[model samples]
Every structure is written in C-alpha cells, then in structure tokens.
Target: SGFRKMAFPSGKVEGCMVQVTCGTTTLNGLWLDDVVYCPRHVICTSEDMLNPNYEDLLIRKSNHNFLVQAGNVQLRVIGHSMQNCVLKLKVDTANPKTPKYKFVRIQPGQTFSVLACYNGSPSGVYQCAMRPNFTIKGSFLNGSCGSVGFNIDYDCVSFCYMHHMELPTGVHAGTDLEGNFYGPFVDRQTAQAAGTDTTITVNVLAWLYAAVINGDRWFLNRFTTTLNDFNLVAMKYNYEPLTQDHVDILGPLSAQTGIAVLDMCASLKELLQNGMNGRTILGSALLEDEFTPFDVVRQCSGVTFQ
Candidate 1:
C-alpha cells in the first residue's frame, strides 16, 4: 500500500497528525473548537459516539421495542449523559421517503420515552437521529399529540396525521424535557383539536379485532397465543374496550363510535360464528354462507350439502 498525495496537514488536533485534502471540502475546526449542537448541524453514527467532548451526540436504541414486528415501532431513547440535558433522537427527515422525529429530555437522573416507526431505510442504514439544538418554535407552543403535552414525533406539526395525538387533558401540571412549563396556549389548542375534524387516517386493524372477533376463541388463539400478542398490543396501545359508563351520553351522536363498532362486530360474529367452528352455521339460508375460509368448498356456490 502506498500513501497518495492527499494534502499536507493544515493543522493538528490533540497534537495528532491531520490529513487535509484539497477538494471543495469544508473542514470545520477540530473537536476542541466545534459545537455539536450548532444550528442546522447534522451528525450521526458516522462520528465517534464515545467522544467525551461530543457527549450530547451519544445515542442508545432501546431494547424494549414496543412494536418490533408491526410498523410504528416505539423505541426508548435514554440519555447516556450524567448531566441534565435535553436530548432528541429522532427519525431523520433528510431522507424524503420517510421523515420524523421524537424528543427525549434527561434531567440528570430522569429518562423519557416516545413512539416512532422504522420508516424507510436507504443504503441499508436506518435513520434515528439526535438533536440537542432543537427548539420548540412558535405556534407549536401548543403541545403535540401523544402526551398531555407530550406526543409521538412524526405527527409532523403540519401533517394530516398530526391530529388527535394529544390527550383530552387541557394541560395541567407537567414539565417539558427542559423543565419549562408547557404553555397554556399549547394546552388549550391540544384540547380543542381533539374535538376537531382531522384527516389523519387512524389505524383500525386492532379495533376491528378487539371490538368484532376478540371474543371468539378461534380468532383469539389464532392472533394472540402469548399474553402480549396482537390482542394485548391492541388493548395497550390502540383499542379501548366498550364500557357502559365509559362516556355518559345518548343518541347515535355521543362518543358512541365504540358502541357502533361493537354492534357491527356483534352482527358480523353472529353471521359467521358457525363458519368459524369448521362448518356452515345453522338457521341461515343454505347454511353454507357461514363457512369460513378453512371450510371445504366441495359443493360449489349454489349446491346444498344437507
């Protein structure tokens, strides 16, 4: 191996040798003079994580991936800092295919969590980034959804999905990662938006199962074998069970969406209960319509076996 003519050292960092190439490369000052959180700055695993000077740049992916197999995976970002610093490890938006972010504020001894998905990865490299320089800009003084003032990141303050990420709570006693009390304007906006119309299409798979077929042992065991399978995932994060006093209201107008879904689920189950049991259910036309996918399609559509 031979050393080609890259460039002579313009300077030295930590008394070590330096390689300076004469292209259009803008080499900033050494680590001693560099600020990691400079505005519009971008850094990642490409840099050394253990550099004592770049402590805020440190990142740790949580082992407790709330949703690994399913999309929208929620991973914890714990600050490795012994210092109380507001850190952020987010979904890098530089990649156009998928862009998102979440916040993590460690108060010397406290750790925090947030929810996000893998999104798309370019060059086999996934994008989860850190930002200590981020600021809660104006208009966003209102809290994002997902927390009382907390929220899942990708809700893009401008995206359609930004809807309903907040709780019904009008922002009571709570502090942001930086110990600053969330603005009341933010809290009220969070509350008002909850009852507003939003096009953020909500995921209904878990709701479909929970409200519709959850009681059927066949589908239940088929979906959730362990204690924390799809069912638990749905219950824990998605669907809320139908309760009588869950909301006190009347008419088809109240917070009756859950009740409506439950009624629909009941009818759906009634129509197909027999099919789920391996044969066409009785008391129905031809008794074969109730047949499930697992049933044998021997007699053709119109033919009756019995």
Candidate 2:
C-alpha cells in the first residue's frame, strides 16, 4: 500500500523532498532520517494551559516523542548498498503500545543516485517541523541555497525476498499472524502481477524457516532458549533487555550459531507471536517463551526484539 511496490521512474532530476501520503499517514523520503518533536513546549506555552487546569498535564506530556500523530513519518534507505538497501518506513503516528517499523528489501540490481541540489539554494537553517500543520514563526532566514540534504533518485526494483507460509509447495498462498493474505505466486512475475510487497510477517517467516533448515537442532533449541531468556528479562522488568544485555545474552549463542543476534531476535518475536496464535511450526521441542502484558508497551524500548 506504499511506494515500494510501484516503480520509481528513471531520472536524474533534482528535488528537495519526496512525500507520499498513504491513507492517513504520510511517508516522507529524506536523505538522513533524523528529526524529533517536543510537544511539551507547544502545550505548556499554548493558550490551552491558561484555559485549562494541570489535571492532564502528565498525560499530555507523554505524547511528546515520535508517537505524536501530528508529525509525518520517514522512509529511509538502509542495509548494504553494494547488495541492496532496505527501504524502511517508521510509523510514529500509530499506536505507541506496538511501535513497529515496516521494511521492503530491494533487489541487488536496483540503481539509485543521491543527487545534489545546487541551483535551488536550499538552506538547512529552517527546521523542518515534525508536527502536523505546525510551523516555526521565528525570524529564520532562508538564505543563499547550499545543499545540506541530498535527494535520492531511487530505482525501484523487484523484491528479492518473498514470504510464503508453505515450503516449496503448490499452496503458495499463506496469511500472517495478523490475518493478512499476500501471495500465492510462483515467481517475481506472479508477485508483480499482484500488488502486495514485503511485510514483517514475510521477513519473520523467512528467517524462522532459514533457522530451521540452516541451523541444527542444538542451535535451533539454543536460539529459542535465548528467546525465552529475553522474555524472562522482559517479565522481570517491564521492557526488553538493553542492547548490551541483549548482546551479552545472545552473543555466545550467535557466535556458536553464526547468525546475527539482531536477526535472531526479529525471527524469535515472530515465533512468539505465532505461538500466541498457535501457528508456530518450527522449534516445537524448544523451551516456550511466555508472553507478557507489557510486551507491546516496551517492545521498542530494547534492541533485542526491535
């Protein structure tokens, strides 16, 4: 339902920004995706303060982070450039309880250029406001244009990875834990004929399948054991383990298994979600990872499952 599925036209044309509004959410394509919004300054200084009491001040301040619906989310290119960059869409406007980042991995043949804006005389001084309909009214000068931000001419290509629930069978169609149906395609041509692209479920299922086939039973069981320990850590605290602690937990396991801890976490979470839905197939004999009430709330707080 985003621009990842569509083909970006081949062009050397230069522009400042690229924006695509999908449904109520706007996906902004920027060079360096880094911006923050502080809502307390707006609410504390606004007229609402004098008019209303401080009864809901704490609740209002809690919405100060990236979860503010007023701001447009960003889509940035990541991953190894020589291979392919994954176009990631971070939806801050959605529920903070389950903050998730959607991704679409590009094919290796995809070509894109980061063009410079020379004649436009773009100034980096003006702060790009993150809040919806919010503008800075200060005495900021849009001075002589010099390119600080680069514009990307992305050459959208076919997705290299496709998620199917069935393993090399005629039944190519399968649904995710969220009950979203995507593909029954035989190849890229079949996928291109359809409109759907990548999802977390796809990536999750792919990794889980890989671990089962690529890794031995010992490695597989240890992977789930590490996943279980992460849930235990989350249960002890309200959040997932910190990056250092997460690494410490899975560092040896990943070293022995020869798989990235980050990838392991991503796959394990999907395994957990699948277990909750009673759809998990692989690692059936491994230790069960118990779900926590605060799983969604603090899911993004730690790097293990993020």
Candidate 3:
C-alpha cells in the first residue's frame, strides 16, 4: 500500500458572525447553503501532487471568492414605492436640555450596516422625517432600527427663594416641652426721644412664659437638659419685660407649684439692673446676687444637677 493512513480536517469559523453576500442581493434573505463552502475533494495523480502541476489543483474556484468582501458587502432591499420616499431615524425628547437622536439610511436591494448620530433639540414627543420632500415615516425597519425617548426635569425653587427673601430673615416660635426660663439681651441703645433714659428696652417675654409654664423643679431640670443639648448658651440667664401674655401662661403654673412668680420676675429684674450697671450677668461675683423663689426651689430640689 502507498500510505498506511490518511486524514483530513474540516474548516471552521470563530468569534464573529460572518455574512456572505453578492452585489445587488439581500444577504439576510439568502440561504446559508447557497453561500457557504462545499464539502468535496479533488482526485489527483502522484505526479500532480509531487512535481505535480500544483497550479491546476489550486485553481478551482471557491464560493468565498465569488461573494463580495465582507467589509465592502451590503444587503439590498426594495425602497418605498413613493417617489418621495427617503430613509430616516427619529427620537422623542420630552423637553430635554440636550436631546439626542440617531439617523440611518438603508439602500434598495443591498444589505449594509448603519450607525446614526442624532443632534436635534426636542420640545415634546417627536418623529423623524426623511428629506427631499420631508416625508414623515416610522423610524425603524423590521426591528433593525427604532426611535428612543429621553427627558430632563429641573426645579427652580432656589431661584424663587433668592428672588423673594432679600434680607435673609427667618423667625421660629415653639413651646418649651421641658420649661426652663431663658432669654436674650443687648448691651445698650439710644432712647428714641430725650426723656427715655437713653435705655431702650426690648423684652424676651416669650422665653419667660416658656419658663413659667414649666416652673416645677422637675420640669426645670428637663428644660435645662434641652437648653444644654441645644447649646443655647445665650439663654443661660433670665430677664424682664413681663407681658400680659407671660402672666396669663405662668399664673396657673405658679399657683399650682406654690412658686412666687413675682419673686422670679424681681430676681431677673435685679440681675438685669446689675448687668445694665456694667456688671456681667450670670458669670461673675453677681452669680447668686439676685435670688428668686424659683431659684431657691431649684437649688433645694437639686434640679440644676440634672
């Protein structure tokens, strides 16, 4: 025998989807068997293989060579029947700041790949129009291409606030759940008219009412904790200018607690008077100078420690 064994391997394709096409033919519509390699072998003499006129053996035509190169190939399909027919892609933007769209064109009787670049500002839902006469048409062909939608929404609340609040003013009023009496003060002011002692008085009656409503030693301790947690150091002391509203809120609480509201008021008034006399309030030798009934109760009940 000339040879003990002989073997042959079939060819294979890898990685990408390969398409074979011919000019003026739609590649996708063609059958695979009509476009791929045939499994057949040629018979040859020993002379043809050896010195062997290799040119004749290699000269047989291949289906791959007969088809168009993959990169240069395109699939062709029938165009719209109308003379004004044009290819286009559309996008819908629901009032976006920067809207994007894509456009693609398919040729008749030829298969081709297309990529679209859309650059149009959109006001509402929009559709694409093909040119020449600008005929509106659905933007996709057999699920190959289609329209996409996008939008952007923004809030102008900050601008609205800036337009309105020119002076940056805010006021907040709340009930003191813990009930401690605290208020704010200023050093000095010129009197509006001559006889007013040049002492302009503004009272924090609200804070005093807050304290009175919470007059119990137990209540005072809770209020103190709240004030400490809030870091409201400016309200560490009490002051005067007791208004009618203050009395109204504090009267019942003071009566029930057996605490003298006048004593608390007088104590705050003395502290303020001393402070007005250029002495520091609540911080120096004057710390215990003015003693209110509320303060005494606070001390005896050991409410300050809490």
Candidate 4:
C-alpha cells in the first residue's frame, strides 16, 4: 500500500513502491548496513536520471535529391537487435501523404531498402520504433519506449526519354520481307511487284491473311479445313486439298518445327490454299492444287480439323 525506503552499495537512498490487497503493509526505512542490497522497485529521484537529448538526424539535401532523380531510395537500419521495428518517413513536411513509404518488422542488425519516387517538395521527417513487443513509457510520445527521428529533403528531376537506334542484321535485311526490312517506298515497290500469280507473293499474302485470322491455333490443326464443311457448302468441294493424311502429318510436323518457321509456313500454306480455292478449278485441278487454307479460322474451325 505504500513505498519503503531502500539503500544501495553507494550509500544512496531510494523508495520502493509496494502494494498489498488484503493485509496491512509496513514501510521499512532504508537499511544502511546492507550497502549492496537495493529493492527491485526502488525509483531513482536523481536530477540526472533523464536520458540525454539527441540532435535531429539530417539525411542531407544531396542524398534525398539524388534519390528523387534516381526514381528510388533506400534506408538501411544497422545495429538493431529486435525483430519488429517501424520506420516512418515524411516527405514535404507540410503534407503527410505528399510522398509516402513504409517498412515494418525490420530485423535487428540487418539492412532493408525501400524504393519511392520524389515529389518536388523540399523536406521530410522519419521516425522508428520497436512496437507491440517493447513499450516506450517514459519521455517518448504516446508512451513509446524507443524512437529515432530523421529529416531529409527531396529534389525532383525533369523527365526525358533516352534515345538510341536499332541496327538491322542477318536475313532481317531486304532479303526477308516479313518484318525485318526498313519500311516506306522500297517496301511498297517490292509488295507491288509481288502481284497475284507470283508464288512468293501469293504465299506471303496468304500467310499474312491466315495469321490475321487463325494464328493462335496449335500447329497440327493449324491450316486445314474440314471436309464436313465442304459437304454443307456443296459448292463442289475438294476433300483432298492437302488431304486428311497430309493434314494429320503436317500438323504435328509443323508444331515440331521451331516457332518462327512454323508461323511462317502456316501462313504461306493458308494463302496458297485460299488462292487455289478462289480460282474454282474443275474436278482434279482442285485436288491438284490442293493446299492448306490461309484463312486460319476457315481452315481450322471444324471439329475434325481441330
């Protein structure tokens, strides 16, 4: 119910606060004979008991400005012993959310980094605490036991694109037409000369058209139209156009081929097939010119084709 006087080895006197719920408690006077014994609850009343004040840790305008331009920043905590720690950083002092970043549960003696963009504001503040696990009850705000504060400045940078040129190489030059060569007048002339009957032109255009449509189908079922659809159209169909046997063989074969050539061949096959079909040949001419449909969806749409 009351505090008792206690003595320490240095001949100092202190009071120990004690409480009893159901009995009268006695207050014992400080025992000078037992110089080394001091009660656990004794409170020191010395004027110098308070901890020394620390200067505000300034992160410096240069460091903060560098991070602003770099588009990211990192804070490292060193010599820490606790598992949970809070790092609070404030940017542009006047506005709390002007630029915000946070890290929690930082490990002791380990370093952690945080990335943040800098707004044009000048200065900010940061604070840290080992929370929930340890309580700061004395002079710290909100009864927190330990905390550190830091002040910093943010220097924003102007935005600009870094420019560079890409050089063409290998078959990517004029030799290959898909997408490798440079554009404009030359490409237009090359395309114009390719024309209708040129196998290369027809093949290229057919593949392009097919790619525009059914490019995503897996290789084996990629460019063959179903015979059933031909029966429905009754528009006189050639079932042997690339034959079911050929379709079965080539589908898996094409898929086994590398992605690039498979893509190119699938397109070319579809174009040739469509071109031959559009001409509407009699009897076996349809079978003779039998090719895979370049209209990818038309080729691969049926259940059998798939």
Poorest stretch of ten by lDDT in candidate 1: 31-40
Evaluate residue 128 in candidate 2 and report its C-alpha lDDT on the 0 to 100 scale: 15
lDDT of 2 by residue, 162-196 (tens): 12112222222212212223343221112223322
lDDT tens digits, residue span 56-129, model 1: 43333232211111123222322112122222222212212222323333221111222211111101111111
RMSD of each: 22.1, 22.1, 36.7, 32.7
Report residue 109 deviation for candidate 1 (angstroms). 30
Candidate ranking (lDDT, best to worst): 2, 3, 1, 4
Each model's lDDT comes to 0.22, 0.27, 0.22, 0.21
User: Which ten contiguous residues of candidate 4 have the minimum total lDDT?
Assistant: 157-166
lDDT of 4 at 296: 26
Between candidates 2 and 3, the one scoring higher on TM-score is 3
Alpha carbon RMSD to native, model 2: 22.1
Ten-residue region with minimum lDDT total, candidate 2: 127-136
Pairs of residues clashing in candidate 3: 74-111, 75-110, 75-111, 76-109, 76-110, 76-111, 77-109, 77-110, 101-118
TM-score of each: 0.18, 0.17, 0.18, 0.13
Q: Candidate 3's residue-wise lDDT over 139-172, tens digit each?
A: 2222111112111111110000000000111211
